[PDB]
Enzyme design. Structure first.
Site, mmCIF file in Angstrom:
data_model
loop_
_atom_site.group_PDB
_atom_site.id
_atom_site.type_symbol
_atom_site.label_atom_id
_atom_site.label_comp_id
_atom_site.label_asym_id
_atom_site.label_seq_id
_atom_site.Cartn_x
_atom_site.Cartn_y
_atom_site.Cartn_z
ATOM 1 N N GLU A 83 26.534 16.197 6.905
ATOM 2 C CA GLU A 83 27.209 17.489 6.870
ATOM 3 C C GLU A 83 28.580 17.400 7.538
ATOM 4 O O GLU A 83 28.837 16.519 8.368
ATOM 5 C CB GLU A 83 26.305 18.524 7.560
ATOM 6 N N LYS B 216 13.197 25.830 1.437
ATOM 7 C CA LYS B 216 13.836 24.518 1.496
ATOM 8 C C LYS B 216 12.969 23.454 0.840
ATOM 9 O O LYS B 216 13.440 22.662 0.006
ATOM 10 C CB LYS B 216 14.102 24.155 2.952
ATOM 11 N N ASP C 201 21.592 16.693 5.472
ATOM 12 C CA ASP C 201 22.507 16.938 6.577
ATOM 13 C C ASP C 201 22.674 15.757 7.517
ATOM 14 O O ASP C 201 23.761 15.581 8.061
ATOM 15 C CB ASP C 201 22.076 18.136 7.415
HETATM 16 O O1 LIG Z 1 24.881 21.431 2.748
HETATM 17 C C1 LIG Z 1 24.826 22.552 2.377
HETATM 18 C C2 LIG Z 1 23.857 23.618 2.908
HETATM 19 C C3 LIG Z 1 22.865 23.380 3.889
HETATM 20 O O2 LIG Z 1 22.799 22.178 4.589
HETATM 21 C C4 LIG Z 1 21.986 24.398 4.234
HETATM 22 O O3 LIG Z 1 21.190 24.210 5.093
HETATM 23 C C5 LIG Z 1 22.016 25.647 3.591
HETATM 24 C C6 LIG Z 1 22.968 25.813 2.615
HETATM 25 N N1 LIG Z 1 23.819 24.793 2.304
HETATM 26 N N2 LIG Z 1 24.875 25.069 1.419
HETATM 27 C C7 LIG Z 1 25.714 26.138 1.939
HETATM 28 C C8 LIG Z 1 25.536 26.621 3.415
HETATM 29 C C9 LIG Z 1 25.513 25.841 4.614
HETATM 30 C C10 LIG Z 1 25.233 26.474 5.824
HETATM 31 C C11 LIG Z 1 25.014 27.843 5.900
HETATM 32 C C12 LIG Z 1 25.056 28.598 4.722
HETATM 33 C C13 LIG Z 1 25.322 27.943 3.519
HETATM 34 S S1 LIG Z 1 25.351 28.977 2.025
HETATM 35 C C14 LIG Z 1 26.132 28.426 0.468
HETATM 36 C C15 LIG Z 1 27.319 27.520 0.828
HETATM 37 C C16 LIG Z 1 27.201 26.385 1.556
HETATM 38 C C17 LIG Z 1 28.335 25.641 1.906
HETATM 39 C C18 LIG Z 1 29.595 26.066 1.422
HETATM 40 C C19 LIG Z 1 29.677 27.248 0.646
HETATM 41 F F1 LIG Z 1 30.858 27.732 0.146
HETATM 42 C C20 LIG Z 1 28.541 27.963 0.362
HETATM 43 F F2 LIG Z 1 28.565 29.086 -0.378
HETATM 44 C C21 LIG Z 1 25.459 24.153 0.515
HETATM 45 C C22 LIG Z 1 24.584 23.940 -0.739
HETATM 46 O O4 LIG Z 1 24.984 22.818 -1.485
HETATM 47 C C23 LIG Z 1 25.677 21.715 -0.893
HETATM 48 C C24 LIG Z 1 26.423 21.918 0.457
HETATM 49 N N3 LIG Z 1 25.586 22.865 1.182
HETATM 50 MN MN LIG Z 2 21.203 22.253 6.006
HETATM 51 MN MN LIG Z 3 24.003 20.468 4.326
#
Ligand SMILES: O=C1c2c(O)c(=O)ccn2N([C@H]2c3ccccc3SCc3c2ccc(F)c3F)[C@@H]2COCCN12
Ligand SMILES: [Mn+2]
Ligand SMILES: [Mn+2]
Ligand SMILES: O=C1c2c(O)c(=O)ccn2N([C@H]2c3ccccc3SCc3c2ccc(F)c3F)[C@@H]2COCCN12
Length: 177
Positions: free
Chosen positions: A59, A113, A87
């Site tokens: 991450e 998840k 992550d």
């Molecule tokens: O790596 C993550 C990720 C997580 O690790 C997670 O735990 C939950 C969610 N994730 N994602 C979230 C993210 C991360 C942390 C808190 C809320 C969000 S919500 C949607 C969003 C993320 C990242 C950028 C963005 F513009 C988003 F709209 C995206 C999912 O696809 C790959 C990268 N990622």
């Molecule tokens: Mn995560």
């Molecule tokens: Mn992530």
């Protein structure tokens, strides 16, 4: 926005910059999705703290670099490449880790998840903002002091939001209707 102000005052500038970059890369506006902005900052900080206690951080990298790191690990350990970007990677247990931070019950988010990834290989660790956690096989990876530091930071963020009348909005924006 009071929430944007809170984010920029309470989060490390490096965290804020990396979360802004991640939202832009994923076509979301931090200025409109302000609770999501706070959520990504919070989760990034948790991932960095977790990694700081053994771990490679996935991450907090642009997507190309994140997959580059994942591929390098898979090439040198033979662990299977995950379908979704995780992550962290755990060099002690030789497994990728997905970190979840939730404003809901840890079991609900854990199930969400686990349903998403469907790859038993990636370890899941969920934290709430009130000291609850749920981890694959009840294996919390970290020792009690490290997990305590993470829980205390999360609770502190929640109470800072509460002091500013931001918590209820933040809590309700995690899950859609
Ligand atoms: O790596 C993550 C990720 C997580 O690790 C997670 O735990 C939950 C969610 N994730 N994602 C979230 C993210 C991360 C942390 C808190 C809320 C969000 S919500 C949607 C969003 C993320 C990242 C950028 C963005 F513009 C988003 F709209 C995206 C999912 O696809 C790959 C990268 N990622
Ligand atoms: Mn995560
Ligand atoms: Mn992530
Ligand atoms: O403890 C650390 C820390 C180390 O212990 C370390 O080895 C490398 C880097 N660190 N630090 C990083 C850190 C640690 C691991 C991965 C990424 C980051 S990036 C900014 C940031 C850190 C910690 C909390 C936070 F909210 C941050 F924004 C900061 C330096 O001083 C105080 C606490 N801390």
């Amino acid at each position: 926005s009071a929430m944007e102000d809170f984010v920029r005052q309470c989060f490390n500038p490096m965290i804020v910059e990396l979360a802004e970059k991640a939202m832009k890369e994923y076509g979301e506006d931090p200025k409109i999705e302000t609770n999501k902005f706070a959520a990504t900052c919070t989760h990034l900080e948790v991932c960095f703290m977790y990694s700081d206690f053994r771990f490679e951080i996935i991450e907090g990298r642009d997507r190309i670099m994140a997959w580059t790191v994942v591929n390098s690990i898979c090439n040198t350990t033979g662990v299977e490449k995950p379908k979704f970007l995780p992550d962290l990677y755990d060099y002690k247990e030789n497994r990728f880790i997905e970190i979840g931070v939730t404003r809901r019950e840890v079991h609900i988010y854990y199930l969400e998840k686990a349903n998403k990834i469907k790859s038993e290989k990636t370890h899941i660790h969920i934290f709430s903002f009130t000291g609850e956690e749920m981890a694959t096989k009840a294996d919390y990876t970290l020792d009690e002091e490290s997990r305590a530091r993470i829980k205390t930071r999360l609770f502190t963020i929640r109470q800072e939001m509460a002091s500013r009348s931001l918590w209820d909005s933040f809590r309700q924006s995690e899950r859609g209707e």
